[PDB]
Symmetry: C3
Subunit: 114 residues, 3 copies
C-alpha cells in the first residue's frame, strides 16, 4: 500500500523517524508486510483548509483491498492520531482519501500485481 | 471538497489572495460550506503539456457528490477562467481530474463521512 | 493522458530531455497524440519504499481508456525508463493506473465528454 501526506507544516517540524513510524503503523493496520508499504511526506506546502492556513493535511491511502467502511474509520483514527501527535495537526483539519486499487491497476517491477 | 493545482508557473506569479479566491469560488460552485473546502497550490513544477514547457496546470477536484457531466463542465469553465485570469495559463494547457468520492472513503476528524 | 513521477532522486540526476522522452514514449504506448500527453516529474521528495530510502518512485498514469490488464503490464515495463534515466530499480517503483471517464476530465473550459 501507499500513503501520501501533503501539509503546510514546515520540514523542520517533521520528526526524524516519522516515515519509519508511518511504515510500521500502516503495515500493522493493513496486515501487509512493511516491504510493501511506501510513504511520501510533503511539507512546506501552500494550502488552506476551510480558508485557513493553520496546520492542515491532505492525505491518501491506496491499497489493493483492505479498504472499506469500518477499516477506513480505524485508519482515520490511527492516522489523525499520528498527525496530531507528531505534526501537531488537528484531526478536523485532515482529509484522508481512501482508494481500493484493483491489482491489475498497480504497476511494479516491470509488471503489475494482477 | 479538495482542489489541487500543480503548475510550472513560478511562486512569485501566484497572486496574493489566490487560495482564498479558490476557496470562496469552489464553495459557491459546489454548494458546500467553505469550512469543508481544502485548496493546495504547487508552483515551480517541472512539467510539460503536449511536449511544451509553456505555462500549464494539472489539477484535481475531489468531492463527495456534486460531480457529473454538466457540473464538471461548469467547474472547468470557472477553474480555467481563474487560472487564466490569475496565473496567465491558457485554458487549453489545463487538465482537471474530477473524482466523485464515496463518503466511506474520506477520512476526517478521526472518522469518515459515512 | 497524464503521467506523474514522484521520486527521492535529486533534481540534478534528472537528465536533460527527460520530460520530452516521457512525452514521446507515452504517446506511442497509449496510441494518443503527443499534444494530449502531459508529464510531471517531482524530484527531491521525502519518501520511503518498503522501509528504506534508496532511489524509488511513486507514479501515476491517468488515461481515458487504454487502461487494462495487458496494457498496464506493457506500460509498467516501459516506464520502469526510470531505471535507465534515474537509476531507480524497477522493484522500488509503484505506478497507479487510472481509467478516467471523459466527463471527468476537464480541459479548455469544458470536459472531454
Ligand atoms: O495492497 C497491496 O498489496 C499493495 C502492495 C504494493 C503496492 C500497493 C499500492 C501501490 N499503489 N496503490 C496501491 C498495494
Ligand atoms: O486519454 C485521453 O484521450 C486524454 C486526453 C487528455 C487528457 C487526459 C487525462 C488528463 N488527466 N487524466 C487523463 C486523457
Amino acid at each position: 500500500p501507499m500513503f501520501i501526506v501533503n501539509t503546510n507544516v514546515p520540514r523542520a517540524s517533521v520528526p526524524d523517524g516519522f516515515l519509519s513510524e508511518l511504515t510500521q503503523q500502516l503495515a500493522q493496520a493493513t496486515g501487509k508486510p512493511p516491504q510493501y508499504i511506501a510513504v511520501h511526506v510533503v511539507p512546506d506546502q501552500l494550502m488552506a483548509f476551510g480558508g485557513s492556513s493553520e496546520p492542515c493535511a491532505l492525505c491518501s491511502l491506496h491499497s489493493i483491498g483492505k479498504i472499506g467502511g469500518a477499516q477506513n474509520r480505524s485508519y482515520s483514527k490511527l492516522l489523525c492520531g499520528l498527525l496530531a501527535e507528531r505534526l501537531r495537526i488537528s484531526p478536523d483539519r485532515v482529509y484522508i482519501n481512501y482508494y481500493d486499487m484493483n491489482a491489475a491497476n498497480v504497476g511494479w517491477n516491470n509488471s503489475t500485481f494482477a
